[PDB]
């Protein structure tokens, strides 16, 4: 509930694999947010995406709502987010840029899978922190 930083439904326009066999760069425009655009690299053998399909895209922190320092998966029966999402990535917002007055772009790297999210009014929701989950469901 309070851990989702961004949430929108996107209509995919283009899915081009550029010299790739499992990663595509999808282009999607928002629904009812005419200014919000989305460019996203997706593993399409885990989450296949076709041109003109509806994607519910959510950005959240704290997906699950020791000093071992190595990431440990949550328990199998854990009531967490991503139960209702088909594709989840973990990355970091490393760049905020202005594309025009009242319009900014946010850049995420999910281990090299890049996402560029564009919009206007998200200033109290999107930050430059490691905690950023991308949740996509068809």
């Amino acid at each position: 509930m309070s851990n989702t930083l961004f949430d929108d439904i996107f209509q995919v326009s283009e899915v081009d694999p550029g010299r790739y066999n499992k990663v595509c760069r999808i282009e999607a425009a928002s629904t009812t947010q005419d200014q919000c655009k989305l460019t996203l690299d997706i593993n399409v053998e885990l989450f296949p995406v076709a041109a003109q399909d509806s994607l519910t895209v959510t950005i959240a922190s704290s997906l699950n709502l020791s000093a071992t320092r190595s990431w440990r998966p949550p328990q199998a029966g854990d009531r967490s987010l991503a139960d209702d999402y088909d594709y989840v990535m973990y990355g970091t917002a490393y760049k905020f840029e202005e594309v025009s007055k009242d319009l900014i772009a946010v850049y995420y790297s999910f281990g090299g899978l890049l996402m560029r999210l564009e919009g206007n009014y998200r200033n109290l929701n999107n930050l430059k922190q490691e905690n950023a989950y991308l949740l996509i469901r068809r």
Partner: protein, 49 residues
């Protein structure tokens, strides 16, 4: 800062109310937007120097 309508304090200010912060009239929205876009801390400048 000035493209957001608020004051771009390139030059130091000099007035009677120079003590008060010039971002009080801003309604907490473009402040966090500007901090989202450019946020240059004193520690960062000193480390760069």
């Amino acid at each position: 800062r000035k493209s957001r309508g608020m004051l771009g304090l390139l030059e130091p200010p000099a007035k009677e109310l120079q003590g008060i912060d010039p971002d009080e009239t801003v309604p907490d929205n473009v402040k966090t937007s500007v901090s989202q876009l450019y946020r240059i801390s004193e520690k960062s400048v000193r480390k760069f120097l």
